[PDB]
Here is the input.
Amino acid sequence: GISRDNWHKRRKTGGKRKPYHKKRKYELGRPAANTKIGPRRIHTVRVRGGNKKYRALRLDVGNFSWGSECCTRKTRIIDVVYNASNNELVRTKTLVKNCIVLIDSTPYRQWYESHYALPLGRKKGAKLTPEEEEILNKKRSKKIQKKYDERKKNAKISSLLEEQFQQGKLLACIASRPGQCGRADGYVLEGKELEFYLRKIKARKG
Amino acid sequence: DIQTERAYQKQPTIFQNKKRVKLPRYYKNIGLGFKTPKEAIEGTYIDKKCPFTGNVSIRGRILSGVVTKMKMQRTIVIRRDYLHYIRKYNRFEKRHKNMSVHLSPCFRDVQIGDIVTVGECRPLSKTVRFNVLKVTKAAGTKK
Amino acid sequence: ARGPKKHLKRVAAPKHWMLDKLTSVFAPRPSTGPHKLRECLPLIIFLRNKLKYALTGDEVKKICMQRFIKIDGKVRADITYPAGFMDVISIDKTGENFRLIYDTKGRFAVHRITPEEAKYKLCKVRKIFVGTKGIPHLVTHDARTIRYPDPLIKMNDTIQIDLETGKITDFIKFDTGNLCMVTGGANLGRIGVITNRERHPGSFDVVHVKDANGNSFATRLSNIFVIGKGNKPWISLPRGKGIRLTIAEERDKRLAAKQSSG
RNA sequence: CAUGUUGGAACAAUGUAGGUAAGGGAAGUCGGCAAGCCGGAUCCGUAACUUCGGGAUAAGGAUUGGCUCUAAGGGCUGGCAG
RNA sequence: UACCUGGUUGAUCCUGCCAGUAGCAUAUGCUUGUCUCAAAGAUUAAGCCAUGCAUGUCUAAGUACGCACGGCCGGUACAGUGAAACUGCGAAUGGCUCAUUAAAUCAGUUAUGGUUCCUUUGGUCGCUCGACUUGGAUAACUGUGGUAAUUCUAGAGCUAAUACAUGCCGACGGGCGCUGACCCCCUUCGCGGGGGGGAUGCGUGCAUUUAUCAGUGGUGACUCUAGAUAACCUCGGGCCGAUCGCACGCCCGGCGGCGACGACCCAUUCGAACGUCUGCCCUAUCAACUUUCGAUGGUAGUCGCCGUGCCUACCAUGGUGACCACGGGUGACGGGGAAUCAGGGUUCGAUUCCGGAGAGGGAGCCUGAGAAACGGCUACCACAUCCAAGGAAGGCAGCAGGCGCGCAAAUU
RNA sequence: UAAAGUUGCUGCAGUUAAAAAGCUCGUAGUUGGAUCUUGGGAGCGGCCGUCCCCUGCUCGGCGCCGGCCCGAAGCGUUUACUUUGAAAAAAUUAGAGUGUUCAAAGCAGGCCGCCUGGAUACCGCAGCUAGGAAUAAUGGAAUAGGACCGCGGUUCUAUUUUGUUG
RNA sequence: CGCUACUACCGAUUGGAUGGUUUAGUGAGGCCCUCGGAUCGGCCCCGCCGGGGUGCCCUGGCGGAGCGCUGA
Here is the structure.
């Protein structure tokens, strides 16, 4: 079909090679996943050595690692913002490796409040009338508030992250190949990584 | 400095967003008893095809030549002169193979004519299969 | 070709099998196994060429399908099974065992041993592999993956397994003074003491070995197998004691028995 | 300005002035006459011959709408702002 | 054997070739008693092929209700033999040929720390803390058929598994993580302040995906192998045995020997691919070549089994060349080798051993560990076969043979 | 193919036989002056012949008692050259072994059950290896930005040591 | 200059035939993505109503549909 052959194209000198053999089967290429954000669709491709390769074609779920205190869930992938390869990979909302995507914040806001015992984002004056997340912040014993007391001094998150939670949309980097492995897994941008990619979102806007 | 490419330029091993209240820089010994230079350890550059601050393992042959072109970016052209014995005409003939060689930016102040040691590795590009392991300064050349 | 190969030509059969030119187009291409293609001796060749139990090819198959032949302590049905260096063929009925040892020349020695000796074979570890739960392994020269090893077994060392069970008993540390079987090159089967470990970062390390007469040589490290400590081997050695006297000494020593017989 | 010094009613032949024609395609004819094709711009590409200037828009191709963006090319006041 | 000799002249001495002279290997001529070895459709036509054969295969051990056969002790099915058929494997080897192909192939050298790998061989297969054996078809068979035609198949009625799938409990009582109700102490008048026990819930193997922390074992060097945590699990799915055979033992329904086959992973073996360094005949009446159709780098991916302009996006303006690049020719597969040979050379290598390519020409694929397979398929092109004119089938550069071409080559 | 020293590297010819560009310049290409390591001790056979000593800084033994004497290890201007070893498919070739009846061949066979065969050489170039250092290449310091030396100070530095604790 | 035989060369014919790579164009085909949906199912839930638990359930000969789910 399409091939990866190291004989069809030119020399260092610009001289052209004559073909000694016709396209070999081990010199194989296949059509790309071009994997979308929709309800999950992953096809199976049989590859060299009768092994199994998982073409993700539509993909909503994926694993996103929070950088600083290592909390990672099966999170929804809501948008594609930036792709350093091609700006046409962004518009046609395609997940590839080193994509700058948007995900759900609330699976990691749920971990923060369970662990750090403080409201994260939340425009101040807003109250929860069911009152279940306020149970997940307060209502502890004597000596185990001390376990939280010494955790409140390692609590102050990056202020660039906090606004993503306040909007409810975390900027994340795809660190897996969804077309090859069959997962849109990755990690959450923090610090100078985010402060870079946020400028390339302003650079696009005008 | 860095980060005038589209993607975020970093080393893929060291993590640089860890909680607190100079970056931690990845470097390995290249092997074969070659010194890892100061600028590869102290420096602020970042290159995946650098054998000091990157994932490229030097294996097989170690060759040497003279630097002839430095117009490709983060890679150069060396020139390797040798003599070929013909057994009929019991004489030699001056030949050369000018192979494309990856010049790590740790080897900063290189000039053309400098003698350069190369180490065989996995193919970096179409024609580049060799990283620079040390740049010795050319014959004379105080300046 | 475009995959594996079933046939081996007689003209490409390796040097030491001593397979002749005029009788057959093909050789016995060995079954895949613990030993390499060129570095083994097939059971078929050993049973009919090296011993003459059989004449034809059928008669070799008519022996090992009664399940008599037992290579390194387990019965193998496969006329073309690769029997390599240190491998013991315990043919149970004749009262004969056969440890395959490199002779002073390139050939595998037709070497009868006692069952008291046959109980173990000697094995060179190739790499120290650590498994999935901090559980180390030892890959021998003949594929015997033995786990929970002694941590003082490096990866040039030779060990002593037990044929009845298959577990480490004794080991030789790779040191100068220990004996050596040279398993490669032009010195294939010279038995001397190791007296130089010459290192090269990147390329192959060469090892200088000295025979009991003081006939010194060298071999790259990948082709040396230690069989003792001092000048005392753990196995039974073939006659001549792997000395490798020169052509002009062989000439007289052939004639010294030829003339002494009458 | 009031259709070029008149109107009305028809819609025949023959004209005069415009068109279009299935399939073939110059077989028509003194002769491709008349008609038809081609046609603007942009991007490739361009032969013989040559007085080296030309031939040349040779020949031969590709493209062209609408919409919606992106980038590039400047004045002016105190390597950057307004 | 380090060799010469005849020929220009009236005669001479030269330059110089023509011609002798022996080997070799093709063809041809005339001849030929014995016997031993032994080339052989390479050269032109990688031209065309009548026909036959050339890859099929069952063990004690996946399946056996075809009386096709058969023994006798049943009513606790199966004796056993065994076509067909399902299944598993092989069909990617071998053979043939030399058309391509001039840093290509190939040879020596190395690298795979950049990857795959059926089988074999050795590991692994209560590591995970949640049924004395399950489900519904299909083949052979019976039965009815359509067709001028094929290794074409349909419809109908049953029947099997190591075919197709769903899935169990034992192991197994707890252990290790974070949780936490609550539970005894001490310290200061109470706060404050220091150590413990611990119900419950949540998660817990290896394989796979990402990220983080830490520095058993191995290396010249790892982003190696382990380790700890956080999660992930593809419904077009990793494993975590529903499998068969023997002799069958032991004992107030439990256990057990020897196999066989399968399987995630790990090594190994046969490999395979991609690279490294050096090396090739003739040509300048081929001096510049390559580049918005990838040329040479950079970055990020896509993709591949992996390394890579392998392919895209976006930059950079490079890259080879008189030490002959690029182009063109080859009556060019490459080397091991062969002939000749004082010493140097020159010439040949189609050809049995290795590596490569190719199956009329290209192209595209299925299946599988492995094929861009041709004694596989789907096209198109060239050619050609059977025919009731509707269709259908094909690939000798396998072995014989036959035609064609030739100076040139064997038995269906 | 040798003959052909009529392709000439070995090894031809160019005044008149075939042939030196009309002449000079000139970048590739080829080739390039002399020049830097000598001599002494010492062991030694029959005045002469032969071997050996004239770099440099942690692990352990033969100790000797903070210091020395000797090995195992890393490094040491390079390159060409030479020598050495490794590694180098068989078959062919050279050739060792042996009455295929001899022979080309074959890898057989040989003794009264046993013995021993089925060596070795060669493999140009390139890469590996360790000697050699003449010859030929090249490099140091000439604005001393120089080697040899401890000084004085500078920035991050992580362990022997301030009992468990900070 | 003339006769003959032979060999190449020039030569109108926008000469002819074989390869080779190739701009542009049409384009079989497999493969891939995406729609599609011919048919074939196993169910839910119900019918004439059988055999047991106490008008409710538990299993079988057989009958439609809302073709209501679900799979290939």
Summary: Chain C is about 10% helix and 25% strand. Chain C touches chain B through two residues (CB under 8 Å). The longest helix of chain C spans residues 247-261.
